[PDB]
């Protein structure tokens, strides 16, 4: 609800489009379990979708590791310091690509 929620004003990071557009996401960490059943969509994404995404976005450093051992997750870090986690456990490859 509005009253029960924070708010802000419409803004950008560093006047992004003024001089030159810059892509805010700068780091992306994938944790994908090599065995877990919930890490199936994640394994598909890494096996046949992460290379293309890396090529299309060369300003984002993508790390992927295989030591959650039961649950995957993607942690996105931005230029302005903000972090943002998203669950990719029990999701399809389409859903992970869209996310």
């Amino acid at each position: 609800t509005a009253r029960g929620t924070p708010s802000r004003f419409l803004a950008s990071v560093l006047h992004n489009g003024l001089g030159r557009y810059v892509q805010q996401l700068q780091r992306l960490s994938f944790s994908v379990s090599r065995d877990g059943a919930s890490s199936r969509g994640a394994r598909e994404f890494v096996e046949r979708e992460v290379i293309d995404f890396a090529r299309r976005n060369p300003g984002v450093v993508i790390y992927v590791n295989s030591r959650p051992c039961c649950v995957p997750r993607v942690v996105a870090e931005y230029l302005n310091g903000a972090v943002r986690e998203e669950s990719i456990h029990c999701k399809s490859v389409e859903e992970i690509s869209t996310l």
Partner: protein
């Protein structure tokens, strides 16, 4: 005790080597020899696997009707690289880092 590797590299002279073995057991047009007989099928495949270090799987012994099919099967290689080392072998872009152990 020293475990054997699944990796198989089909030799270039295979089509020649195979024929030597055929001469040991069985005319022209040998690609179409039938193997409904089982004694000779066993002798041939045992020789081939003792040489090339590769036995046919039980799931592919009824798909080998003719020696042509044996040649076809021996023309496909097997990779002994798990996803571990196939991921970090595709000239990853510089901005993607994988970690394995």
């Amino acid at each position: 005790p020293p475990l054997r590797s699944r990796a198989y590299t089909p030799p270039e002279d295979l089509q020649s080597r195979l024929e030597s073995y055929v001469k040991e057991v069985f005319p022209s047009n040998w690609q179409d020899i039938s193997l409904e007989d089982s004694r000779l099928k066993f002798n041939l495949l045992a020789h081939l696997a003792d040489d090339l270090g590769h036995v046919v799987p039980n799931s592919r012994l009824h798909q080998m009707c003719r020696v042509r099919d044996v040649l076809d099967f021996y023309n496909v290689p097997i990779q002994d690289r798990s996803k571990f080392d196939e991921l970090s072998a595709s000239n990853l872009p510089p901005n993607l880092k994988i970690t394995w152990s």
